[PDB]
Design a protein around this ligand. Sequence first.
Ligand SMILES: Cc1cc2nc3c(=O)[nH]c(=O)nc-3n(C[C@H](O)[C@H](O)[C@H](O)COP(=O)(O)O)c2cc1C
Ligand code: SF4
Ligand code: SF4
Ligand code: SF4
Ligand code: SF4
Ligand code: SF4
Ligand code: FES
Ligand code: FES
Ligand SMILES: [Zn+2]
Lengths: 63, 111, 430, 242, 92, 94, 222, 71
Amino acid sequence: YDIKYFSRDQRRNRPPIRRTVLKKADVEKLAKEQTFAVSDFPPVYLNSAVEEDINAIGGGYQG
Amino acid sequence: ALRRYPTGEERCIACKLCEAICPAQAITIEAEEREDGSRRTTRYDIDMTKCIYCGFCQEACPVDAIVEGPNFEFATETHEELLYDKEKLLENGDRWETEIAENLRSESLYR
Amino acid sequence: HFGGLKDEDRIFTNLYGLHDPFLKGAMKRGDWYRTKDLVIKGTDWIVNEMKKSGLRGRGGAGFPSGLKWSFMPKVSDGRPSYLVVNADESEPGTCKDREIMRHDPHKLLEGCLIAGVGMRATAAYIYIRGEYVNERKNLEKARQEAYAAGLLGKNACGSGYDFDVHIHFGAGAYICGEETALLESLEGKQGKPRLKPPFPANAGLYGCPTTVTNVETVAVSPTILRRGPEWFAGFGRKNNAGTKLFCVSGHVNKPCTVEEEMSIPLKELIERHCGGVRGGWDNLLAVIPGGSSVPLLPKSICDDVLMDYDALKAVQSGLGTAAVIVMDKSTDVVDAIARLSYFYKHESCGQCTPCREGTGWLWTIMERMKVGNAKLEEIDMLQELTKQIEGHTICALGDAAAWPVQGLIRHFRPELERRIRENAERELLQ
Amino acid sequence: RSPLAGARVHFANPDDAIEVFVDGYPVKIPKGMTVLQACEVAGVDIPRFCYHSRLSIAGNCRMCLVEVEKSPKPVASCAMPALPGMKIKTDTPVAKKAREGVMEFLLMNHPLDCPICDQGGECDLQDQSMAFGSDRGRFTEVKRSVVDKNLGPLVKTVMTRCIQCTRCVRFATEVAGVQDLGMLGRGSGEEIGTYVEKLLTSELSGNVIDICPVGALTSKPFAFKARNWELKGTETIDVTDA
Amino acid sequence: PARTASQQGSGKVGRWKINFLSTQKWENPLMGWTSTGDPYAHVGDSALTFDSAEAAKAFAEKHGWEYSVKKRHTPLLKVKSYADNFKWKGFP
Amino acid sequence: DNQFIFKYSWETLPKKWVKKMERSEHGNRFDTKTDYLFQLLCFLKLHTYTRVQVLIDICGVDYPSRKRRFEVVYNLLSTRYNSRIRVQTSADEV
Amino acid sequence: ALNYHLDSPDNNPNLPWEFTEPNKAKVTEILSHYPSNYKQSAVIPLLDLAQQQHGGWLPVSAMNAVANIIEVPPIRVYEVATFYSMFNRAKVGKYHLLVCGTTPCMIRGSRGIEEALLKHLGVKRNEVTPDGLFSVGEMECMGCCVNAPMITVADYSNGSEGYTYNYYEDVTPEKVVEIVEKLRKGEKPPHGTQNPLRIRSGPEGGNTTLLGEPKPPPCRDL
Amino acid sequence: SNHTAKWMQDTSKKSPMELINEVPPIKVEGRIVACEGDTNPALGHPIEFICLDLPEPAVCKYCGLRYVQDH
Ligand SMILES: Cc1cc2nc3c(=O)[nH]c(=O)nc-3n(C[C@H](O)[C@H](O)[C@H](O)COP(=O)(O)O)c2cc1C
Ligand code: SF4
Ligand code: SF4
Ligand code: SF4
Ligand code: SF4
Ligand code: SF4
Ligand code: FES
Ligand code: FES
Ligand SMILES: [Zn+2]
């Protein structure tokens, strides 16, 4: 009994696309401003095998 | 298959929602105003060699006119036999009306 | 503090019609005294007197009459310009214009002349509702008497002003009370109100500049002009000042129409001139202060509320036509508001979508909730529908239909809660 | 910001060009041209049911409501004249709520007969409901019903679908020149047509079905022959007249 | 393609199409369907949509087939007013 | 999500060939010139912090309106850093 | 059925309708009351005059006659007569009884008055009695709300002359029955309020205002 | 007639037009009806409201059943 679609219109309620034309001066400004640290590098998605028995999770029953 | 109302009139108005949604375009329909002003289809054919048996028409029907019946053992020796039309669809609906009605009740519960 | 007018300060001295309402009675009571001097004084002078008299529109809008008259074009263009006097009262609860026309018609005619002079109007049209036929006959006889005596026509008085007054009657439509709908009906079309990019002061009755003014304001114009704007501003308080005649109706002991000073307490108005509520003040449940347009008020607010434009607007309500309809504990306010919604649905013109369909939806919802066949979220939806109808409709009749339901939801919500819960319990039992 | 439908503005004189703001972007507009056409020049279209460019202006549907700054109530775009330095907005919550409410009120009494309605895929009520209106319906009570009218061998009338926009009442008055159609009645139930049995007869009578947004007036020879999406349209000229 | 006369929406205008004039459709003897023999029966109306007439001309010149551009017709906006809707007739 | 190596690339990648970039939740997008696409993909595949060492696919899109109708799109994945990247260029028939 | 014309051996366009001589004089006066080029403004008075002359209802013949007089297409007159409530387009009795029913009267006994009328006459809403003397209905608020429940009697017996749209206020069901009996017998009851203890639109018993003799205002120097 | 012979060639069984003409009109007390197709609204057609002011029977336009007002 509280139909109101302009608030739950998930299809059309999106912000407009923003465009910025960066020139040579802006590119040089960003290049000089930016710097790299040991903590700013992308994190690694690391994973490894464990060699775990089949009956280890819940005794093989729980599922 | 095509059904009918309990009175006996065709259940299918010519809304043309069948071929608007039929992904394989296996349904062709033409219509005109009847003698008493009712909107009825004067031509309604379905290719059983082009139908992908997907049920889009039977769920797009506003009046539950077209239904994909429970029958599946209708293998024919000729492609022309497999090319259905309105009279064959209507006689299929009349023949399988009771089972189609039972299935339609059970599934209209699930809707 | 306010109220208790004396017979000398009362404007409509023949309200109950105990004396002769014709020309001889009018002259005896003090009508057409110095109309020649008033017309000679000047249009700008009349407009200034109205502006500084504090007079406000008595038809419900409450707009200042002086400013509304000054909105007319000063330079006489090719178009003749017109005065129109709204005698078409159909809002439930109010019958003041009926008494004014029936018992003081010469006051109305002199007011038409004065307003036309002050607004540079060539002619005046008095739009009587079709139901009033005896009042129309009385006003016709008064107009013929005035024309024979020379009070109207080519020479209204010793002044050289040209003024002609005609009266046109409707055919039983509530929308025809609206200004633009009334102009359309007077044109001979259906009583469908216009929009408001063209104001009536620019393109009105026939595309000519016309001004639509209420009977009470136009009739009290000559009296306040003759007695001084200071005298009129003495009564009442602040902006809303003067003498207003209230029709007290409903479950009161002796319902009556009485002219009283503005800003009188509602309780004092009810229990001094009318007589009081049927079973005492404690028996009072809800009062609609104006006509059916404005939202109602419970007993709690009516204890101290003041009958004027501002206090009734300080609370979520309005003065409107200042015709109070009272309801004691015996009746059911839900059924009363359901009947009001039915009236509004019946009387909507049906040109604009939110009022053509929304009024019917409100009536059906109110009929359902009278028995109790509704839900809590359905009363919330009713409030939402009221809000949807209110601001998106061509004229103020959409507001007039939305307001009573909104007020009932705001004030008497627990009654609806109890009715819905009781009906749910009965349905579960059955 | 090209004008809507590539439309070209007609300036009576270059001196008269007021600068009106639509959705933040200002545009130049003639003096007397309304807010709806101002936004059309700006490039945004507003839903409309009782407005036709050739016909007159009426606020029958009350759906072209936009929020103009310094105004308590939503204003009708098709009727409010554009003033200099006026800030018009169409994507505000006020305008969206107004459109949704007006669509709900329009659809509360519309019959559930779109599949038999010949305006399937070309019905302004359907497209505007799917674009601006809500996806649900709060109405479940008794609808209204209207008996059909016989208006000749060309116009088939289903008056249950009529939204009473008076677009055809004033079409016969202004363009056709024969005053037979009319809005008669008062309130929620008001019918349209002729009081007496009067078949509408005019050379331009075929245009009445064209301007009807809903499937109220339809071509009788093309009653139920085909839908819109099926038909392929070729732009040609006529040879019956000169 | 011009705006449809049935409805006033203007979101399907401004696009340009190549109209392969392929009208060689007949009726199937067996089932009465609309047969064809031209590969370009529906591609121009279905898949080929161009941003502008210049783009359509460039495509036609690139692909070599002769073309003829049809001038598109555009509505003209004129001032309308509800005040002019209520005009005053002259004296009798 | 995982817009880490995309930003790191734009920080470290030479700016000569980055014709345009798009930061989207539908997929980070690089659009470059056809001359430098091989060098750009070689940099991304070999760099230690943008290791998109698996090529998901190559797609084509037809845009008849544009002068260069064909759009060649490369969807790449970095399993070491767990993120998808997109690099596209424009090519015509000849 | 109430917003379109269904042909009957009466009330069809083939029958001719025209005003009598006094009605023609009244039509001339009404037209003279309005500008010559705006004679359509007189459609409501002309329709009212036609309704009084034709026994209380407007036939399509009178509709067309009025449209011809005001020089407009008949559809405009049809619209005008259909829009307004007072214009009856179906046959009613010689006496049209109308009850209010609107809330200020409904909370005072309007529903009881209407049900008493229905029981006494034996007919339902908007249905003429089988004899044809009476026809009872209701409509929206009709003024004099403060004067208790009320009924209006439209008297279409003598025609255009002798037509009375009389009011009857402060009525009880017994008083309404008595008024109906008097109207059926042929004596015209005194219209107005029915309470002998009050003045028209005044408090019951003595008045509380305007007790003294009215005097001219002191006035103002002008 | 022509339409029935156009979509059907059996010309031995009863066409739906004849059956729907043979089913009698349905007399209803009220001025408006709700036409649903059968006893189960969910298994019929979209609800159609029919006005019955005209003397002649009114076809439902869905499952046409010719409802007629009582009096
Ligand atoms: C639904 C509705 C009912 C109205 N009823 C009346 C009425 O009974 N009397 C009246 O004078 N004006 C009526 N009007 C019009 C306004 O009151 C209008 O402001 C008035 O004609 C002129 O204002 P005034 O009070 O300054 O004279 C109505 C308007 C609407 C929208
Ligand atoms: S079930 Fe068959 S006929 Fe129906 S939509 Fe699917 S493919 Fe088409
Ligand atoms: S969807 Fe149903 S009613 Fe419509 S054409 Fe198909 S079978 Fe007929
Ligand atoms: S708000 Fe709309 S429907 Fe209501 S009376 Fe006014 S114009 Fe007519
Ligand atoms: S015009 Fe109305 S009845 Fe026809 S398909 Fe559109 S929304 Fe439905
Ligand atoms: S019939 Fe169509 S064009 Fe005419 S008023 Fe109704 S909806 Fe509008
Ligand atoms: S199009 Fe403007 S109100 Fe209808
Ligand atoms: S409420 Fe009955 S006369 Fe006004
Ligand atoms: Zn049905």
